[model samples]
Target chain A: LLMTQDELKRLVGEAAARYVTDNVPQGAVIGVGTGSTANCFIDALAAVKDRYRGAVSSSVATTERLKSHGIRVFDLNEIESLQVYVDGADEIDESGAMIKGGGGALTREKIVASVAETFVCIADASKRVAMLGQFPLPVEVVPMARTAIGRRLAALGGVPVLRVKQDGTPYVTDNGNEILDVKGLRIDDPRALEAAINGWPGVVTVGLFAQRGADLCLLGTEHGVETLRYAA
Target chain B: LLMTQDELKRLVGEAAARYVTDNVPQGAVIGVGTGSTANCFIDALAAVKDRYRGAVSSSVATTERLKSHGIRVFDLNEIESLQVYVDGADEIDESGAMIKGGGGALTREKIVASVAETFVCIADASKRVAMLGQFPLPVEVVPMARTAIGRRLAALGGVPVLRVKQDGTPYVTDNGNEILDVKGLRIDDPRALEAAINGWPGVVTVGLFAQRGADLCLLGTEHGVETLRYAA
Candidate 1:
């Protein structure tokens, strides 16, 4: 009657691959994101790897995963058009906007998603939310601007903590900036808040994906995959 | 009296320090910026070091410069108030918005200035401009996002060239980011354009200082330092 989170992740991942196999044109590049669910998606994509030409990875790990499956990976700059970007999120609301970057890959993920023609968010049912803010928002920032940005985030009514590794050293992002995991931001107007935070100098990227939010979402329930669509 | 550019620089720098000495409260921390003109400000501020508590420097070089003068340098987080931030701009418009970061320290400079009560821009008269375009606008971005961001800048009618050193290698910032010197942008609506570009995900900081533009500008000319003021 029930399924583990991993099992649901695999379910959604399979659904995402099936969607790609059905819709995406042959010889077109795919855009992919990071993390464990994306790992499932990557594995699922391999069965139909020949259907696409190559992929643009949102993280180094994703690139390695795609190669392990013998799927060619292309650099983002080389490709002018990316029809579909499939990724996972920490939390997704009804609006298709998400709270991402829990794995510290938000900056690159958002950048890739920004250019994609359609963003497909894949996640387990647990990741869905009635509203955002249950999960902490991750903000990548320049190291030197940490305190100043923290103060600004505080003024926005969130508790900002510098994200660190288990060893207690600072968690350095692939982009070489620091992460500020901000909590207690009940993002009512996600698009507005996203633009506001992005407008702040020194902010590399915020976890809120409202500007170029998901076009479609494949959510895994206990029974089956539920597909949701968003408007332009 | 035709003063050389260096003479004009020293004049404005001294004028900036005098503004700090006269208006900035004693026992209060000051915010400092970077570059050759700022170097003059640092040397000038030393004359009245005891008039204030200390300073929050915008760069490592500025910190060293402050220390060489035996002035205390405080971390930005430790200070609750920064009465004034005195810095130089590549170009200052009649509206007081500026194009800065020619030295590639835009991220930290803007961070330090964001929380300050007043921003004082000091420059030789050549830096004064009718509009904000002749100087290429520097946009600090994550290294991985250089191309994607460049494309976006191009879409905005600017020619974005990746900033490289004389040796032809990519110029890396102190925060481990890259700079894109975007040309051909005639910034008519400075504030709106600043907000638009800042909303981009990969951007760490844009060279445009329009959100928190100059509160005062001291332009040094052939005659002398000319004091200017702006309204909030």
Candidate 2:
């Protein structure tokens, strides 16, 4: 049986807040990811307020959300490095392979994560799928590259749906670009698939975070939140 | 007296054709620059179009012009490297330092130059001036970067004009973007100017080709044709 959205939200949300409160160091440059799960973490961080250092948010949405709670934010270009990036994954496996980009911050998120010393994923238990294709994989692409990449996506055994937002407009990323949702990927190797998606001309970043698994995942369940620790 | 449009066309047009016919090698990857002056070069190159390998045109207008004349054209990404890039200059100095971008291909032009083994300038004798900045020093700027760069350009002693087309639309490049024309530059050190402009966010290119001057200059004059050689 699955948990209701309200139940999962409360469970996941609370766990995320608690993790950051206990773990984050002072004067740390925190990288915040986007999505409901990450939002829960941020809300929790807001409760503590003055504990950790300045934050460098990974998305404009995250930045705005954090600003609402009076969190200090830095632009991506401002700092060459960040201390820790706390985000949420769409999928995670035992191998530490993961998929992200349900919220269109893949490019900035990858950039921040690339600079961060540690990355943590906060997600509801449902996001821990046995397979990656169960979630629609998002590939951020340059507008000029969409048509060419659409054909390439088809070649990769996936149907491409140009990602769209609630307003019926094509979903634009934090960089103001389109994202193609590549579904039906019966992926044998998530790492290889990630590379191919990146190789495509229009692709800025694929949701595939296979090589960059989260250091820790706070998976909230209906019973109680459990932590999934990756052996270092 | 200034030459009539027809006379200017003929004087520059014939010399440009002759210059390419004599200079371009077989199987060459050529770079076609921008402007009415560069159009003359394309018209000339197209005459012996079958002689060289292919062309990498800097401007969309120049690309269309080259294709019309049956010259094989390639984008910057298509070519392994450019052997030579020939274009017109608004002004050139004693050190071969020149101001370009009247046709707004500064970004692509610089890219071609960065890849090319040699770069040549074909111009009418009148294009030569005692110093640069006699004509407006056109700078291809990112539209988002206009205001910040305006202050930067002003500090550099330039009267900056954001390039806009006749349609009341911003002057869009072949790559699809806006331009900023910075006037009132003596360009004492074009190398420093190039470095400074390269640092700006939305700046694609500037008209300064100081460190990388033309390898050769073909000047059209009433006294027939003049050739200026630059050291390898």
Candidate 3:
């Protein structure tokens, strides 16, 4: 009971760091993600920073954090190819497909992950799921397209709620776009839905990580970090 | 042969205006697009402006032009639905699919067209084609993901050139994103390619209008404006 969720996060973080150190070769630019779980990974990965070339951060905040840890941060565009991308998800299904962007960095995360050879998803056991869509899917859109994109999401059986902060102002993403936290979408086919939502005119990014989902999961459990490997 | 291309544009614009006057009901807000041909349409439509409600403009320039003509311009969000969307195309196929955004207003044009019950394309005969892809397809993207999206576009068998100005500055869209003018894409299945590109993480909008292409095209030929209709 003393082992809190933070402890689980830290455990998974260490597990992912270990995976990177053990498996990933030297002189490689790894992709790093945002949020608390990824923060834990950054801290763990920092210890062996010199083992890899540098990290391609999925968010500006992550870039700052990487620099603070004395870990070199590289721009994704500058990087030729990423060996591994380590991140966390809002919910991971059995197939390793995830519902991400709860922290509003899905666009960059997906961008960084696109060039990665491997996606290492580190999360607590609570983040694992039988199916996706329990956690509301975050979709970034141009501010003007909020109402229009919401209608499209609704047509896809999603009850879209514009994510707002205190005072009811729209919650803008790192990309200067607004968020549409789509609800009631039981994502039976994450890839299909991802493609459909992504194709919508005003959509910047849909936080469904299905087409480029996690290749492996370092799940923090009470016993230890559970290693889950998906297909090549 | 006596009539210049501008003359044809003027002819088509007048034809579209005539279509509007004859068919569109009174007190309906229509969707207007950007570019020179649309400029002519705006000019022609101004004569009968009192018969219809204000227009929902696809770009700031279009809105300004409408204002100059004393035509009331409404925002897309304020309008419930649009009866007609009038725009020009870079290249329109026989199927009514088009490759637009040559003027860097695709994102807003697509957004405006999405809410319209009917899309009416007005263009000179030179803009018409048996198959699309003669003109480079414009794809708007988040600035940070330009290179990454270019790679994706390359994978789709097209050359993605960043639309730049004379000083080599990237052309930013009204929505504040960058443009990738993709070349050498003979879009046979435009809707399919559109969905694929739209699903890309950083893609804001693809210029392919197959999924919701024009219901009618008023093609400006030397003899007269040819009425080309596509199935709903």
* Cα lDDT of model 3 by residue, B119-184, tens digit: 999999899887788799998887768888888878879899999998999888776788999888
Global lDDT scores for all candidate models: 0.88, 0.70, 0.87
> Model 1 Cα displacement at A124 (Å)?
1.3
> Which number leads on DockQ?
3
Worst 10 residues of 3 chain B by lDDT: B74-83
**Per-residue CA lDDT of candidate 3, range A1-232, in tens?**
4578999999999988999989898887889988899999999999999888788899978999999988888777787677889999999998899999998577889888887889999999999998899899999888768888888888878899889999999888766788889889898898888877776777888899998899999999888888998874
CAPRI classification of candidate 2:
incorrect
Give me candidate 2's TM-score against the actual structure: 0.56
Candidate 2: give the clashing pairs. Answer: B142-B202
Per-residue lDDT over B1-232 for candidate 1, one digit per residue giving the tens place of the 0 to 100 score: 7789998889988988888878877887889999999999999999999888888999889999999999999887677767789999999998899999999478889888887889999999999999998899999887767888898889989999889999999999887788999999999888998988887777888999987899989999898888888877
RMSD vs true structure, all candidates: 1.5, 10.0, 1.5
Q: Clashes in each model (backbone N, CA, C under 3 Å)?
A: 0, 1, 1
- Sort by DockQ, top down from the best: 3, 1, 2
Task: Write candidate 2's Cα lDDT for B1-232 as tens digits.
Answer: 5565446645666665666666666777678888887887777677777778778877678888888877887755456556677777888877777887776656556556655677778777878777788788877543434554676778878788877778877777654446778777787777666655643433445667776778877777766567787664
Candidate of highest lDDT:
1
